[PDB]
Structure 1
Amino acid sequence: MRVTVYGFGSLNYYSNKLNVPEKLGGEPPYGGSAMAVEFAKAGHDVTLSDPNIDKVPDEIRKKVEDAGVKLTTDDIEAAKEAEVAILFTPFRGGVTFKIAETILPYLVENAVICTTCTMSILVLNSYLQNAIFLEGREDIGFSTMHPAAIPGTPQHKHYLIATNELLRKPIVTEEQIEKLKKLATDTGKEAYLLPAELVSPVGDMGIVTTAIAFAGAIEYYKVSRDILKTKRSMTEFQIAQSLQVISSLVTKYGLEGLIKLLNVDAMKASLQSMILDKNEQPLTVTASKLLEKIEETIPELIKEAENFSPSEPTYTSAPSPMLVEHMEDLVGDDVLKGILRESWKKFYENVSERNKE
């Protein structure tokens, strides 16, 4: 099939900022380039579009082209007759939204656009709904080819592929998912089909926070079951509230507001009475020790927290499924889709616009 990868992968990032060969392994080029080369070796008609093709060293550029990858800077031409479009594009500056919007009217009928490690597919889908409508591209599907790893390293043995599970409205067809599974297995990668909104939580660099919080939830569950002897429903409420609170505080107030509003000293003091079996609570013990030295490891965040003050009120623990359900009864489903869209767009904007020098 005809596949176009948008984004080569910053050669300088993967060698001078993060020493990928030493930290993870393999050899350059890494990123979308490595993905394209793999597809080309498997017999697919691959094109790779990046604005900085000319900056690629000849030695690297020859390897890619010798695989069968056509290199170009023209995103529009690259999209023509493409069945699969993989966005290995920047999170910053809305670049992933802009590129997807540019290529939208030129993709072949029933094409599928795929996000990777830099963007969640539903957020992209939210940004594109007006373009989709005006251009009549309701045939375009939306899913993912999330390497959940750096392509080109030995750890990349898989792709996370977004499905429609848990979605009120589908974003991808079975025919489109099958093409993504084919690209994965054709290149010896295992396909993990995941509900669309779980792809980025599982696959992104933030798997660090996803996994720690998941294992931490399980640890609390065991303490609740074995030591406290409390009810399952109370345990689940506490887990959901904790994680919703942290998410909402980071969303609205960032890490500085998270630290100031929860109050580390209060958390430390409170946690002492939930260290009930040190041997069975390795995460609790470590967390309590990390909190004790927090002023030494993140002094810049502590300083920002001292100077933080919440300018707007909020509720941090309101479960999103309840808010969505209540909203379904207050307004039409047509209106609700717009509200969910604007909420995903505002999430991206508020978080990326907050980062001010």
Structure 2
Amino acid sequence: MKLAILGAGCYRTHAASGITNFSRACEVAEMVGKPEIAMTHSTITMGAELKELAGVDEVVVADPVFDNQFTVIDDFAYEDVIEAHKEDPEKIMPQIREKVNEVAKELPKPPEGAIHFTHPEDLGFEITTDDREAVADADFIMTWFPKGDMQPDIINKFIDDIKPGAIVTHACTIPTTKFYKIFEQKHGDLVTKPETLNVTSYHPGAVPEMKGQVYIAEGYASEDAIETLFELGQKARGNAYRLPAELLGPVCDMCSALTAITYAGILSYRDSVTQVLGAPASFAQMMAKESLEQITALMEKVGIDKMEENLDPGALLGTADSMNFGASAEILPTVFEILEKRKK
């Protein structure tokens, strides 16, 4: 198949964050014996994986930046980075960040400037400034566009050139629904033919060069399209996750921590009710729904910063302790230390 990456991306924001590395990129480079992969970042790493590990036959990277100031840093040798990542990334990352940060002081933001460490061409990739040429014959188009009102306009330029049934994906810069609306149009006429694209996501849930993982939004694409991408991503990224499009944010955004906590609570609570009390899962759900809707409603009603003034954390210590059995007992003791500490 033909993969058309639209957006090479820039490492400035990764280096600026001060908390990333090339652990995955390195791991891949060592697996396939191509040192140049070690310092690839963003879609280049993901493209590297799909070509080298998933068997994607043709890769094309499209980005206006290639004609603009596409900056490649040759200061760090690939092998040094690989060997440093083998024991402790921090033996070379602070040095890497300062150079990127220095380059980024004057360098314009994308698409006028991009900080990379590997030339896509070296990975056998075809580079292009124009997106239409890239999407031509592409079975899988991977978008890595900027956050903003430009994604619909960026897309409209190559939408007619998209092959029927192609898998089109988005990443952390845009919600699935919003992205899907650009391609599929509700209002029209007999003349305007609906698109037939399989819209999904190829969301890293982190900087692709640091972690090997992908999140694939379900609900807009054919199941075959989801299976095809799921199988590609499982091979390319190592850890692929299929999930409803509505949960992509909850799981990949800064709220991930609360979704995690809450989900553990729900699953634990449910199991204590079905396995210890023996009640049907429908009773556990009715109870769960009560908790969730009300505590969320309270946070909306008075504000997340005024909950304690309305519901003292201590009020739950006197009642929840009786439900401390089954799976819930794996999480309640911790939860109680937190409410003990916050009680009025």
Residue deviations 1:208-231, cap 9 Å, x none? Answer: 222111112234446667999988
Q: 2:313 aligns with which of 251, 261, 268?
A: 268
User: Shift of the alpha carbon at 1:114?
Assistant: 1.1
Residue deviations 1:210-256, cap 9 Å, x none? Answer: 21111122344466679999885554234234444666788x89xx9
Higher relative contact order (Cα pairs below 8 Å, separated by 6+ residues): 2
Alignment-derived partner of residue 146 in structure 1:
203
Alignment-derived partner of residue 12 in structure 2:
12
Q: Is the 8 A contact 2:25 2:41 kept in 1?
A: no
Residue deviations 1:307-332, cap 9 Å, x none? Answer: xxxxxxxxxxxxxxxxxxxxxxxxxx
User: Shift of the alpha carbon at 1:202?
Assistant: 3.7
d(CA) in 2 for partners of 1:123, 1:267: 39
Alignment-derived partner of residue 138 in structure 2:
82
Map 1:175-214 to 2 at 5 A. 175-187=224-236, 189-214=238-263
Paired residue type of 1:217: I
Residue deviations 1:73-131, cap 9 Å, x none? Answer: 433333233221122234x3244444344432221222121122343323322354338
Q: Is the 8 A contact 2:4 2:138 kept in 1?
A: yes
Q: Which runs of 5+ in 1 are unaligned?
A: 165-170, 294-357
Q: Which runs of 5+ in 2 are unaligned?
A: 27-37, 75-115
Alignment-derived partner of residue 159 in structure 1:
214
Paired residue type of 2:265: G
Paired residue type of 2:3: V
Q: Is the 8 A contact 1:49 1:72 kept in 2?
A: yes
Query: TM-score normalised to the size of structure 2?
Result: 0.65
Q: How has the CA–CA distance of structure 1 residues 13 and 28 changed in structure 2, closer, same or farther, with 3 Å as cutoff?
A: farther
Aligned residues: 280
If you compute each CA radius of gyration, which structure gives the higher value, 1 or 2? 2
Q: How has the CA–CA distance of structure 1 residues 114 and 271 changed in structure 2, closer, same or farther, with 3 Å as cutoff?
A: same
User: Shift of the alpha carbon at 1:23?
Assistant: 9.4
Alignment-derived partner of residue 284 in structure 1:
335
Whether 1:40 aligns to 2:85 is no
d(CA) in 2 for partners of 1:196, 1:292: 38
Query: TM-score normalised to the size of structure 1?
Result: 0.63
d(CA) in 2 for partners of 1:231, 1:186: 39
Paired residue type of 1:273: G
Match of 1:99, SS state, is: helix
User: Shift of the alpha carbon at 1:283?
Assistant: 4.4
Q: Percent identity, aligned pairs only?
A: 23
Q: Is the 8 A contact 1:246 1:258 kept in 2?
A: no
Q: How has the CA–CA distance of structure 1 residues 268 and 32 changed in structure 2, closer, same or farther, with 3 Å as cutoff?
A: same
Paired residue type of 1:172: A
